[PDB]
Amino acid sequence: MENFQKVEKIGEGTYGVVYKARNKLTGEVVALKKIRLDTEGVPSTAIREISLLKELNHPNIVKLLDVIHTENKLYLVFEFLHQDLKKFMDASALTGIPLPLIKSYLFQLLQGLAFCHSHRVLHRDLKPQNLLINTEGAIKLADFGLARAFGVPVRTYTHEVVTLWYRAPEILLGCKYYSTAVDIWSLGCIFAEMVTRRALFPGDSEIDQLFRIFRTLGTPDEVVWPGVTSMPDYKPSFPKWARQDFSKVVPPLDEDGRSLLSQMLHYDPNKRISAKAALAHPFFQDVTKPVPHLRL
Numbered sequence: 001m002e003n004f005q006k007v008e009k010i011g012e013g014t015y016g017v018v019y020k021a022r023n024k025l026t027g028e029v030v031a032l033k034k035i036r037l038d039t040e041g042v043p044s045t046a047i048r049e050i051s052l053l054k055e056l057n058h059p060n061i062v063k064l065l066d067v068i069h070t071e072n073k074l075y076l077v078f079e080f081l082h083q084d085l086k087k088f089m090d091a092s093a094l095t096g097i098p099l100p101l102i103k104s105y106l107f108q109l110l111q112g113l114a115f116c117h118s119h120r121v122l123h124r125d126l127k128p129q130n131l132l133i134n135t136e137g138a139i140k141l142a143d144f145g146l147a148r149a150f151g152v153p154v155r156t157y158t159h160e161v162v163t164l165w166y167r168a169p170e171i172l173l174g175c176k177y178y179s180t181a182v183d184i185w186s187l188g189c190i191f192a193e194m195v196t197r198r199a200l201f202p203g204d205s206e207i208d209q210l211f212r213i214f215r216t217l218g219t220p221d222e223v224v225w226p227g228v229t230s231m232p233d234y235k236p237s238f239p240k241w242a243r244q245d246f247s248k249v250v251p252p253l254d255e256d257g258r259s260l261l262s263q264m265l266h267y268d269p270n271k272r273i274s275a276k277a278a279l280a281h282p283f284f285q286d287v288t289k290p291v292p293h294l295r296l
């Protein structure tokens, strides 16, 4: 809109392009998301779906400040946070993020997710790029509720590929009515990634993604994942790999963290820990809120 001066492109929200922008009236600087319209103006369904998001406010959810549906168009105006977790991970790769700060971030996000999930909202696409951090030690969920309202192309507008690395295996095997558990999976993968400084399952197509998972956790079967063999894209011809021990997967994480993670990465989404229950895990008995060394 004319109310906003674009200061810089900071991202893509797979549907939309996101800009740092300055409110010409209120001086506030904001993240401005302009949603790519199916051109099929804006489905009215989608509008009332985004409306609900304006009320889903939490210290660990990036605050949706306004939705602007005017003339053709749909813009989302969020509070601006000064970087994503991906850049901090990148910046931290040589020394590794301190464990107490890993823990604070995991904790905080579990609080975000516990809140969302308690309102039957799923993120569905958690990744380091959709997690935003500030200088005070907050970490916040972003870029969600978008994906319910419209369906997103994989090549998107910007021609960059969609990241699969954080996809739960039920989604990959073709389930439609998957659950809050998908986000716990994605968060486990990020958790591992913060701890190791390497992505856990950096697949580059759906089957590579799924076989990377199989390789580390074992090919799923009916013993560990009752029902798995009736899922839409499950093939009896999947290679049958044996499970790694987690001690190989995320050294040198301590037994509590490792145990937490293995429950976040349970194949069966029903045996996968919830966000609420994860908060009560012994790993957070010594949880603190440290200050990050940022590079703004």
Ligand SMILES: Cc1c(-c2ccnc(/N=C3\C=CC(N4CCNCC4)=CC3)n2)sc(=O)n1C
Pocket: 010, 011, 012, 013, 018, 031, 033, 062, 078, 079, 080, 081, 082, 083, 084, 087, 132, 142, 143, 144
């Ligand atoms: C980036 C973003 C949103 C957003 C919301 C609030 N703050 C921010 N802040 C930044 C997000 C990204 C960013 N980058 C800095 C350099 N390139 C990597 C990403 C700098 C700032 N983004 S909302 C959404 O859908 N997306 C994709």
